[PDB]
Structure formats: structure tokens, C-alpha cells
Design a protein around this ligand. Structure first.
Ligand code: HEM
Ligand code: PIM
Ligand code: HG
Ligand code: HG
Length: 397
């Protein structure tokens, strides 16, 4: 028990939204297990229960700053966040940086861009309807919408949306092992250095304006501000893959789609349940290092050891979610947006986007449905975040 066997967790592409069989086995073995991923060196501890995941992610004894130096076993060939980025920061610095933009990401904060976002979405959907079926829901709506929304919230001119997306793709491609010069990945860095440091020098409510003002008041450095802007910009694109899984599920189970289309009142609750259930990523992402000797469920974890949490596993904890594999719109303390200091700042924005998307796609498109069999919809390979490559759809024209 104190010395669990190391389980090898090689990279494997899973069909649609099927749950990882290896994760299912780890969940059955006990609260604390040990794993070895494709990259990095050695092994790491893993926790899967809802309460243990909340502990590891919300306790000062586990830190992110120490992860970078020790080649911890991991899925990705290379990390996305750089040294000093919020992902690799611990309080107090992490707290100081996150607070500079927190008010822009709460429910009250994201409401500011809700009307404009709904307008942009209706234009994308209407353009799709006008062109006629069949179409690729991902290329026509799910991909462009999130990019436009995060750029709007950040204060990035619409004319630069395409550039932002290309830069985001290069950075993510680099994580997959692709060879990209630092000079290539720092283009977004230079872009935000200009926007935050030279422009948006006046009063503003968008994210880059808040960052610029915080730098002006000596609360954060330009470097800290730029690093945060880059990660927020990249993060905004996650809604594309997640909403893609959401619609693949809804269209694969016409019954659920009918329920949402006919019962507007339950959409908020239903979307929250889909967010809990959808297996958003492959394996696990960034670990935390035990900063001192600690114990979890009696298991001794030595200072220096790496510990991963699986939010996907925690979302299926039988204790917290009875009959976990069942999607129940009337079920929900899920942790799809993480837990602890590092919880996703984009959670409320993702909810906003998901709600607008469900409304538009289910109410504006006459008799929407998949144009191919559920099993024939291609999903991303060798990826970190799971999602459809395309979503062929048709409707009444
Ligand atoms: C359904 C969509 C999304 C999901 C499921 C999601 C999920 C997550 C998860 C699980 C984490 C890791 C928490 C940890 O490190 O323990 C995270 C971090 C993060 N997400 Fe998201 N996210 C989504 C959308 C977004 C969006 C739209 C943005 C941009 C506003 C964003 C920005 C970030 C940032 C900056 C972090 C790093 C936070 C930190 O380490 O302090 N996310 N997200
Ligand atoms: C890899 C791992 C996590 C993410 C992410 C977190 N929040 C939004 N995107 C993006 C790429
Ligand atoms: Hg963008
Ligand atoms: Hg994620």
C-alpha cells in the first residue's frame, strides 16, 4: 500500500469521449498510485479521489515552482507554460498576479462581453445557414467563436485574431514535440509587450488595460503582465475542443439534444453536468512537488516527490457523484475547471460561451443533426486536449 507498483501510462488515442481504460484501473487500485508517462524521467504519485485531489491542489505544501527543475515524468514532450508563468508560480507571487485580472473573469466581469459575443455568434451561425448544408460545425462556428470572444475580452483588435490563433497553434504545436525556435514562440510575447506597455495607456476595462494599469501602479512587472496575457490568450481556445465534445455527445444521443432544445430552463444545469462528465484531456497535465514530507491517506510522500491529480477521475468519484458514468441533468461540485489557487480563471467565460453556443445551435438551426455516424466523427490524435477534428452536420433547408 505504501509502495504501489509503477503503472506505465503510454500515449493512446481514445475514440470520441470514451473514458481511458488505464485511468479506470488506477481508480480501482486505491487512493494513491504511482505512474510513469511517456516523457520526462522516473515516476510520480497520482491521486484520484475527489477529497484527495482537493487537498493536493489546495495545500501550500505542494508547489508548482519546483516542478521545472526535475524532469518529472509527463505526457507532453515539452511544457507550454514558461518559467515564471502563473502555471509555475506559487503564492504569494501567484496570488498577486492572478488578482490583477480576477475581476474581469468573474460572472459580473464576463457579462461585459456577453451581448457582443452573442451578436458575433449569430453572425457565424447565420453565415453557415446561408451557405447551406452540409457543413463542419467546428470550422464554421466552434473554432472561430472562442477566438473572437477571448480577443474581445482581452482588448485585442479584431484584425489580429488570425495572427493570435496562428501564434497559439505554433506554441501548442511545440508542446507536441514540434521544433519551433524561441523566436517563433515569443511573437505573441512581443505583441502583448507592445499592447500592454505602449498602448492601452488610458483607462480601460478590458484585460490588457487592467494589466497595463497594474504595471503603472507598480503592482506587477511588464514581464509578469505579458506572461499572463499570453497564457489567457492560449487558454481561451479550449472551448473549441470542449464544446466540440459537447455537441458530438448531444447529437449522438438525439434524446438529450431534444431535452435541451425543448427545456430552456434546464440548460444551465445540463451544461454543468456535461462539463463534469466530458473527459477534456488525455492523462494528466502539470504535477506539483511535495515541498516537505507529507502523508495522504496514510501513504508517505517524501519531499521532492512529484504528485499528480486527475480532475477527470475526481469527477467520477462514486462517493461524490452516485452512478458517476451516468449523465444526469438533474444531478454537482465537479472540478473540470480545477481546484485551489490554480483553478481556471476562464471557467465563467467558458460557461458563458457554452451557454450561448447551446442556445444558438439548438434554437437557430432547423433540425440540426450529425451528417455521419457518431463513430465516424474523427477525433484529435496525439493531443493534450481531446476533441473532434471536424463535426459534419446538416439541417432542414
Ligand atoms: C471548458 C473550457 C476550459 C476547461 C475545461 C479548462 C480547464 C482548466 C484546468 C483543468 C486547468 C488546470 C488547473 C490546475 O493547474 O490545477 C486550467 C488552467 C488554466 N486555464 Fe483553463 N479551462 C477552460 C477554459 C479556459 C479559458 C477560456 C481560458 C482563458 C480565459 C483559460 C485559462 C486558463 C489559465 C490561464 C490557466 C492557468 C491558471 C493558473 O495556473 O493559475 N481556461 N484550465
Ligand atoms: C494544454 C493543457 C491545458 C490547456 C488549457 C487550460 N485552460 C485552457 N486551456 C491547454 C493546453
Ligand atoms: Hg484570440
Ligand atoms: Hg485543461
Amino acid at each position: 500500500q505504501a509502495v504501489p507498483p509503477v503503472r506505465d501510462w503510454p500515449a493512446v488515442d481514445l475514440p470520441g469521449s470514451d473514458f481511458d481504460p488505464v485511468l479506470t484501473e488506477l481508480m480501482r487500485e486505491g487512493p494513491v498510485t504511482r505512474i510513469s508517462l511517456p516523457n520526462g524521467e522516473g515516476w510520480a504519485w497520482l491521486v484520484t479521489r475527489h477529497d484527495d485531489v482537493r487537498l493536493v491542489t489546495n495545500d501550500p505544501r505542494f508547489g508548482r515552482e519546483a516542478v521545472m527543475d526535475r524532469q518529472v515524468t509527463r505526457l507532453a514532450p515539452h511544457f507550454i507554460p514558461a518559467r515564471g508563468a502563473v502555471g509555475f508560480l506559487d503564492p504569494p507571487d501567484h496570488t498577486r498576479l492572478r488578482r490583477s485580472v480576477a475581476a474581469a473573469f468573474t460572472a459580473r466581469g464576463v457579462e461585459r462581453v456577453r451581448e457582443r459575443s452573442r451578436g458575433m455568434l449569430d453572425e457565424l451561425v447565420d453565415a453557415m445557414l446561408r451557405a447551406g448544408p452540409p457543413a463542419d460545425l467546428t470550422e464554421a462556428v466552434l473554432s472561430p467563436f472562442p477566438i473572437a470572444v477571448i480577443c474581445e475580452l482581452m482588448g485585442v483588435p479584431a484584425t489580429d485574431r488570425h495572427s493570435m490563433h496562428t501564434w497559439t497553434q505554433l506554441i501548442l504545436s511545440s508542446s507536441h514535440g514540434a521544433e519551433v525556435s524561441e523566436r517563433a514562440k515569443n511573437e505573441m510575447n512581443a505583441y502583448f509587450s507592445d499592447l500592454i506597455g505602449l498602448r492601452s495607456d488610458s483607462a480601460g476595462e478590458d484585460v490588457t488595460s487592467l494589466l497595463g494599469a497594474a504595471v503603472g501602479r507598480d503592482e506587477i512587472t511588464l514581464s509578469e503582465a505579458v506572461g499572463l496575457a499570453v497564457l489567457l490568450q492560449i487558454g481561451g481556445e479550449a472551448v473549441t475542443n470542449n464544446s466540440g465534445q459537447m455537441f458530438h455527445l448531444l447529437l449522438s444521443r438525439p434524446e438529450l439534444a431534444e431535452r435541451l432544445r425543448s427545456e430552456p430552463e434546464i440548460r444551465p444545469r445540463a451544461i454543468d453536468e456535461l462539463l463534469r462528465w466530458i473527459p477534456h484531456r488525455n492523462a494528466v497535465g502539470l504535477s506539483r512537488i511535495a515541498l516537505e514530507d507529507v502523508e495522504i491517506k496514510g501513504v508517505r510522500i517524501r519531499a521532492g516527490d512529484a504528485v499528480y491529480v486527475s480532475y477527470l477521475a475526481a469527477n467520477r468519484d462514486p462517493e461524490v457523484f452516485p452512478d458517476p458514468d451516468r449523465i444526469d441533468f438533474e444531478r454537482n461540485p465537479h472540478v473540470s475547471f480545477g481546484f485551489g489557487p490554480h483553478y481556471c480563471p476562464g471557467g465563467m467565460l467558458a460557461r458563458l460561451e457554452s451557454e450561448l453556443l447551446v442556445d444558438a445551435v439548438l434554437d437557430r438551426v432547423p433540425g440540426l443533426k450529425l451528417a455521419v455516424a457518431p463513430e465516424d466523427v474523427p477525433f484529435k490524435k496525439g493531443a493534450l486536449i481531446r476533441g473532434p477534428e471536424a463535426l459534419p452536420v446538416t439541417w432542414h433547408a
